[PDB]
Amino acid sequence: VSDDFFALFQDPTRTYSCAYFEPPELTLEEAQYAKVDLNLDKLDLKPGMTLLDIGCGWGTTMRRAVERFDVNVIGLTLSKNQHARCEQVLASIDTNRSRQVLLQGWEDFAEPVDRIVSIEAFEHFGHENYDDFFKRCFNIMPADGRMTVQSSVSYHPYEARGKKLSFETARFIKFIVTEIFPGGRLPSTEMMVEHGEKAGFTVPEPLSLRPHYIKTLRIWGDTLQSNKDKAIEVEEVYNRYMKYLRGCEHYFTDEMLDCSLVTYLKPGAA
Numbered sequence: 578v579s580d581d582f583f584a585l586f587q588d589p590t591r592t593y594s595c596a597y598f599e600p601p602e603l604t605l606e607e608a609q610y611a612k613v614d615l616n617l618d619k620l621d622l623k624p625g626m627t628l629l630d631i632g633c634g635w636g637t638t639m640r641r642a643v644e645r646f647d648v649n650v651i652g653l654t655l656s657k658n659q660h661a662r663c664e665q666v667l668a669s670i671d672t673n674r675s676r677q678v679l680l681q682g683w684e685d686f687a688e689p690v691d692r693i694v695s696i697e698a699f700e701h702f703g704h705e706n707y708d709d710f711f712k713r714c715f716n717i718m719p720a721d722g723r724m725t726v727q728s729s730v731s732y733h734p735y736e737a738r739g740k741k742l743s744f745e746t747a748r749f750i751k752f753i754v755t756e757i758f759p760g761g762r763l764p765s766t767e768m769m770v771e772h773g774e775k776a777g778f779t780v781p782e783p784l785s786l787r788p789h790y791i792k793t794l795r796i797w798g799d800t801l802q803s804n805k806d807k808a809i810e811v812e813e814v815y816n817r818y819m820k821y822l823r824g825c826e827h828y829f830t831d832e833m834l835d836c837s838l839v840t841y842l843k844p845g846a847a
């Protein structure tokens with residue numbers, strides 16, 4: 578997967594996550610900023626604080642946080658591509674706030690921060706590591722800390738929609754977690770909430786982003802579709818991602834997949 582490839586289907590910001598069409602008539606690009614504001618507005622961010630962005634992408638969330646809230650920022654990513662971009666994105670801001678991006682996972686991060694944002698990185702963590710993740714996030718934050726985690730989710734193998742559809746969905750999901758995001762693994766919303774509660778977080782009712790992901794995958798699908806040619810010369814990979822995009826839209830429509838924005842409040846939050 579090359580940067581030039583994703584360039585032919587994503588908005589100019591290169592946000593590789595669910596957009597937020599509020600109001601409904603926003604551009605994909607506008608909708609990606611609105612999704613960033615949706616997360617940050619939950620975080621009770623005050624000037625001088627340090628915001629930790631876990632899985633920080635091309636640095637879009639962090640830039641918007643410095644600009645909108647007058648905070649310091651630290652970003653974690655496991656991609657050199659993303660790290661160098663973020664670094665130049667951060668260095669370009671007119672601020673005296675510190676900005677730092679580290680090529681490393683949350684597992685090796687242990688510094689005090691005030692607030693945490695994480696948009697669709699959580700699918701890479703592994704069920705096995707959820708307890709450590711939430712414990713780390715609770716422990717690095719002050720008494721009034723808050724964290725948002727946004728993540729696609731599925732449902733426990735038990736959770737009825739027909740035998741036919743449930744076997745089918747399990748397979749399509751295998752394919753995502755194998756050839757699109759190798760090593761990935763979807764949680765359920767219930768797991769997201771429960772592991773946070775066990776670490777001692779108060780967890781309000783999660784926000785479902787389902788119709789927004791449906792809307793996002795359609796624009797993605799449609800834009801890649803229109804570059805059938807331009808994308809092939811940069812056929813195999815093309816048909817793979819078309820199966821992925823059209824497939825997810827379908828299963829989000831069918832209500833076999835969902836996307837949750839979960840907020841985690843420490844006992845002393847405001």
Ligand SMILES: CCCCCCCCCCNCCSC[C@H]1O[C@@H](n2cnc3c(N)ncnc32)[C@H](O)[C@@H]1O
Nearest residue numbers: 632633634653654655656682683697698700701729
């Ligand atoms: C609708 C689709 C259906 C659901 C399919 C599974 C979802 C796949 C996730 C796609 N969301 C993309 C957001 S970008 C992921 C970011 O998280 C980072 N990351 C991954 N693991 C860690 C980690 N352990 N620590 C810090 N950062 C991490 C990557 O470097 C990257 O910047």
